[PDB]
Ligand binder design. Sequence first.
Ligand SMILES: CO[C@@H]1O[C@@H](C)[C@@H](O)[C@@H](O)[C@@H]1O
Ligand SMILES: CO[C@@H]1O[C@@H](C)[C@@H](O)[C@@H](O)[C@@H]1O
Ligand SMILES: CO[C@@H]1O[C@@H](C)[C@@H](O)[C@@H](O)[C@@H]1O
Ligand SMILES: CO[C@@H]1O[C@@H](C)[C@@H](O)[C@@H](O)[C@@H]1O
Ligand SMILES: CO[C@@H]1O[C@@H](C)[C@@H](O)[C@@H](O)[C@@H]1O
Ligand SMILES: CO[C@@H]1O[C@@H](C)[C@@H](O)[C@@H](O)[C@@H]1O
Ligand SMILES: CO[C@@H]1O[C@@H](C)[C@@H](O)[C@@H](O)[C@@H]1O
Ligand SMILES: CO[C@@H]1O[C@@H](C)[C@@H](O)[C@@H](O)[C@@H]1O
Lengths: 348, 342
Amino acid sequence: EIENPTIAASGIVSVANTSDGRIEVFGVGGDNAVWRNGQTTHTGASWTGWSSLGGSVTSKPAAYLNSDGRLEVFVRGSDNALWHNWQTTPNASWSGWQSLGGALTSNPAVYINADGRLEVFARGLDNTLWHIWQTAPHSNPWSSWYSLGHVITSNPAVHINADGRLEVFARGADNALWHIWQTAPHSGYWSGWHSLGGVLSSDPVVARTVDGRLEVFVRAVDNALWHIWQTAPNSSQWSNWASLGGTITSAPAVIKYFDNRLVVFARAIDNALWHIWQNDTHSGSWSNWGSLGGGLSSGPDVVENANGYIEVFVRATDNALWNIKRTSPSSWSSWASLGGTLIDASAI
Amino acid sequence: IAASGIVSVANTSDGRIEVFGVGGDNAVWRNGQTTHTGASWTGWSSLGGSVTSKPAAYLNSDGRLEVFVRGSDNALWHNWQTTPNASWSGWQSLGGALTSNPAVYINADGRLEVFARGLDNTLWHIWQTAPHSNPWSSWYSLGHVITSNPAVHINADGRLEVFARGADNALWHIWQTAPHSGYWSGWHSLGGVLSSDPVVARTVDGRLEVFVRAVDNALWHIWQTAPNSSQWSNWASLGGTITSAPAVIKYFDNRLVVFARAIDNALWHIWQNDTHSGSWSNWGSLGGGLSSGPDVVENANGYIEVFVRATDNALWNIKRTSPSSWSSWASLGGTLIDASAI
Ligand SMILES: CO[C@@H]1O[C@@H](C)[C@@H](O)[C@@H](O)[C@@H]1O
Ligand SMILES: CO[C@@H]1O[C@@H](C)[C@@H](O)[C@@H](O)[C@@H]1O
Ligand SMILES: CO[C@@H]1O[C@@H](C)[C@@H](O)[C@@H](O)[C@@H]1O
Ligand SMILES: CO[C@@H]1O[C@@H](C)[C@@H](O)[C@@H](O)[C@@H]1O
Ligand SMILES: CO[C@@H]1O[C@@H](C)[C@@H](O)[C@@H](O)[C@@H]1O
Ligand SMILES: CO[C@@H]1O[C@@H](C)[C@@H](O)[C@@H](O)[C@@H]1O
Ligand SMILES: CO[C@@H]1O[C@@H](C)[C@@H](O)[C@@H](O)[C@@H]1O
Ligand SMILES: CO[C@@H]1O[C@@H](C)[C@@H](O)[C@@H](O)[C@@H]1O
């Protein structure tokens, strides 16, 4: 069996914007339960503190905002089935845990189709890519499970093309970046598999540029941040792999700045939070790596807050969730503890 | 009503502004940024047709632009990209008998839905039967009597909500009972005395806010007190003496910015100082000589772009170029007419 390098450490929480402009974070507690924390209001003046959604889980959770404004959380259960939990009205009471069945061997990843139906992707018992979907927009019930085939050796990553076609990425048995896409938006058909090559030592992490090009970030076997991109929207042509250097020890976290420039965050060999950023959205010019310090026991996860500024979440050495955020166009916040005790329940 | 904007302004799925106006021949003409940097424009191309309303462009969730306009026969007509950012379909009739500009929004299920005043002066609507696809429903009346072009937005919970001035010149609104539920609410009055179309934004914290010119020619606004709120604020005056429909857009930090032509026919703007206190700036001039209201969009650099017709009847452009700077006033040329149906 081709040997697959250990994937870079995952982030500690699923970070989601609510329909009322607040950050909500979902992590796994010492009791194996999903625990939640969120801003009291969109100004982010304070947080609610940790409350338990309960359950007993065996993956990193994945939260997603339905097109009717209700958050929904996906996780692999004690039984290796997919379980989910939804707000019953926006930013209100939670449903409790419902089984969607299956036999999963990775974290679940979620995206929304061009018709408002959520669709979840996970490695199945046979190590092929599996998927499942809402049968109606922002609503139960769900399909049964289907295999898209292949052999994958990482958690899958999912995004949507400029033309509304979902596209999923994973490391293959050969360590290359593999991907597959809907033939047209929720057409009922997928394209078959394409290798982008490379030798990955992390999950793929996918953004769409403001001009509509998918761009994928990975740690490679040299422990550098590498990336690769569509040459145009929906393009039949990808770039060559290009190194951004560094010695990173986490999955990269990617977000567009308020001016749409890509910014990548990762833990480095010194256990600090580091970041590197586009100088512009076309020429392909990137900055040098800048440290933001801290002592990280996980990868970062990132969201844009209601002030239009980047917020970053990590687990610290005290196993609490820590937060650092932009406070203006020209300044970072102080490191602050949001407390809690979080375990890394990442499935791979 | 207060003078309308001259163009429908829409972002493409490949991060370029496209503008759609009516030429002196009554055809729909379009102009686009050559790339997402917005450094240059293609120049004007004709989509043809003979039109009797302002066009309304909208991006389908499959990334294809689509333009809606009232035809010579007062029916709704539409023209769509057959693939994203490529060739146009030409003009197809969706029938009906319309007495206003069409306004368009996308449902939580990816179906476009078009609102216009009908032959009996009630609110009419029509929708795609499947997401981002033909064919369309037949026409249905949601009733009432309206005296302005309708405006449409979506609540934080995915319910479409439509705004129109009534025969009392008050702001009226009606909403889906739930996202694309098949049912709508009763008509409700938010009062006031409007002298323009309503223009609607949704705040970053998920509250609908409506801007109007009032009978005193001042900018006024009213807002939901909370997302999906069963309670709105009182009307509040932002003052000024404006001679166009206002145009509203969130800044990169989500502060609302409102643009309007003033009595001096210059482009003026006023903005929130923050998104939690109801505190607004003073009016600031950006100058120009305007023969229309402004239309606004956020470009692929994440900055506000503004489009107005000038005294020469050309389309002019001013935009933010950074966190700290405006662009030059640039002429995109052409000759545009105001084909607004009301
Ligand atoms: C705030 O509560 C603390 O953090 C949670 C995430 C859980 O690990 C819990 O057992 C612990 O007591
Ligand atoms: C509430 O149910 C508990 O949590 C779920 C997420 C599943 O792991 C299930 O097996 C377990 O009993
Ligand atoms: C109904 O869901 C649609 O059809 C299924 C058969 C799958 O192809 C899925 O990716 C797609 O969104
Ligand atoms: C149709 O799908 C498009 O072309 C394919 C050949 C791939 O390059 C894919 O990334 C892209 O989305
Ligand atoms: C560029 O062409 C000019 O502007 C167009 C919008 C039309 O009004 C046309 O008749 C005129 O010649
Ligand atoms: C292309 O067809 C022309 O333009 C349409 C928008 C309609 O006004 C129609 O009656 C006219 O003949
Ligand atoms: C299918 O379309 C849905 O049902 C129709 C009967 C209308 O109520 C419409 O607003 C809604 O989007
Ligand atoms: C259910 O609809 C909500 O409550 C209504 C009574 C109105 O305030 C409306 O703006 C809002 O969307």
